[PDB]
Amino acid sequence: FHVEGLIAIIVFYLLILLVGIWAAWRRDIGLLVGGFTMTATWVGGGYINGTAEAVYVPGYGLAWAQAPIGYSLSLILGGLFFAKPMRSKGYVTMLDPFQQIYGKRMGGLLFIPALMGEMFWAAAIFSALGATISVIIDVDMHISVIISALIATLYTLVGGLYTDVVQLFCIFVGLWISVPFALSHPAVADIGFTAVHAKYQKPWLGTVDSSEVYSWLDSFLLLMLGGIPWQAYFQRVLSSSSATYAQVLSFLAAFGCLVMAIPAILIGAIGASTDWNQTAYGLPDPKTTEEADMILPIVLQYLCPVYISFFGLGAVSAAVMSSADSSILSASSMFARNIYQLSFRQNASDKEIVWVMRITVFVFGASATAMALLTKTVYGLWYLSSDLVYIVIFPQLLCVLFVKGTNTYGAVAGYVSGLFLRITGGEPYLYLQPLIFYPGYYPDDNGIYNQKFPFKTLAMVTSFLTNICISYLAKYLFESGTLPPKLDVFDAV
Ligand SMILES: *[C@@H]1O[C@H](CO)[C@@H](O[C@@H]2O[C@H](CO)[C@@H](O[C@@H]3O[C@H](CO)[C@@H](O)[C@H](O)[C@@H]3O)[C@H](O)[C@H]2NC(C)=O)[C@H](O)[C@H]1NC(C)=O
């Protein structure tokens, strides 16, 4: 349990770093590597445990595996539409549009939500690696996450003195070497049978009532429109010189997302359909014990033979550990650099980068660990990340680039309106009891009060409308008399 897991993880991390430096030492092909790396930005750590939750958990099923189909569609929406109206106007990074119209100050107030979103994502990755380690070396839930994240952040500490391709290859080989074998286990029954007929559990094929179809469309639109905005995607496409190449790149990344989601769904489906009274895990099921998180590492380690298991499971753990470094470094660096330049001015010569990035990266890792420690879901963290991004960033991104005449008053008005309409409406994974109680709430765990009336999409739309309304109203009273131009907090005249 302990020794085999530790040696497997160490060996595979050594081998992945070795291949990385083999690359870093030293056409007809350029569609391959770019598409694979840009889909490697999303896939990895996230999907496998997230969609494992989505499929395995009773009641939700496939029809509630929103993100594994949500993001791919998100990629197409980002490319097929926003590929054009940023090339022609010309922009270097997504930092630029906000700091071009909204002065310079407004940008940091806008990009704090991006920090919190990628903080959610980093917490999800840390939770996934904690579960994988807690299965491979079978220690604990508190111990695995803290050990994992401390090592990850202290390695990213001196990580400053391509590898994203080998991540996907390891992920693909690891899943596609276990599932053909686990599906053969006598403990498992026909994956088709429990899909439609519900022999040993509710059908792992998701079921949605006509009543909460509004909530289903809320979640779908949230994920689909909250994937586009984020920084890594814009940074990648903007660094691509030719436009059509970006469209084919979006096609290929969405296809990579969808193909890598195929082995991940079947893993959770087997985990659900399996008769657990035969395996050596004990009759207490992953739901009847508060450990539904670990369903994928559990099905790999226990429902596969000893020799096959460590290849795939160590590959998964090593890949997600590697992704942790990139996510942590990028998330801390962008905030520190942008907002520190923002505040009044600060010498970047020989203090800012090292000192500020150090402080921010350490505290960011600590906070990601702290919130990944209490939430026993990863699908929930995803939802929360894309949820906040959808609430705040996307409306103003869409009005800045697709709409004309947007101004700085609209930025603050949309910010306040969106944030209020979201936080006041309640959040069910944490204990955010709502204050409004939109028609359609159902009694639950007193932490979960879902309103079938979509308020997330309503908040997004009304924040965009608030931006437009206050912007053009202030533009209309631009004048003397009508709050004369003497009164001017953020410049528009
Ligand atoms: C899986 O579940 C089954 C049943 O849900 C468990 O198997 C049963 O275990 C008992 C205890 O050894 C076996 O003895 C039986 O006990 C009852 C108690 O009332 C008695 O009336 C019977 O005459 C008999 O002595 C029982 O035969 C056995 N049933 C079967 C079908 O094997 C089992 O412990 C669970 N876990 C596994 C199989 O890992």
Swiss-Prot record:
Optimum pH is 9.5 for choline uptake. Transport efficiency decreased at more acidic pHs and is abolished at pH 5.5, which should coincide with transporter internalization. It catalyses: choline(out) + n Na(+)(out) = choline(in) + n Na(+)(in). Changing residue 91 to H: In CMS20; no effect on localization at plasma membrane. Its main location: membrane. Glycans are attached at residue 277. Residues 83-105, 162-167, 235-250, 315-352, 404-411 are cytoplasmic. One of its GO terms (biological process) is neuromuscular synaptic transmission. Changing residue 45 to E: In CMS20; loss of choline transmembrane transporter activity; no effect on localization at plasma membrane. High-affinity Na(+)-coupled choline transmembrane symporter. Functions as an electrogenic, voltage-dependent transporter with variable charge/choline stoichiometry. Choline uptake and choline-induced current is also Cl(-)-dependent where Cl(-) is likely a regulatory ion rather than cotransported ion. Plays a critical role in acetylcholine (ACh) synthesis by taking up the substrate choline from the synaptic cleft into the presynaptic nerve terminals after neurotransmitter release. Homooligomerizes at cell surface. Interacts with SEC14L1; may regulate SLC5A7. This is High affinity choline transporter 1. It comes from Homo sapiens. The lineage of its organism: Eukaryota, Metazoa, Chordata, Craniata, Vertebrata.
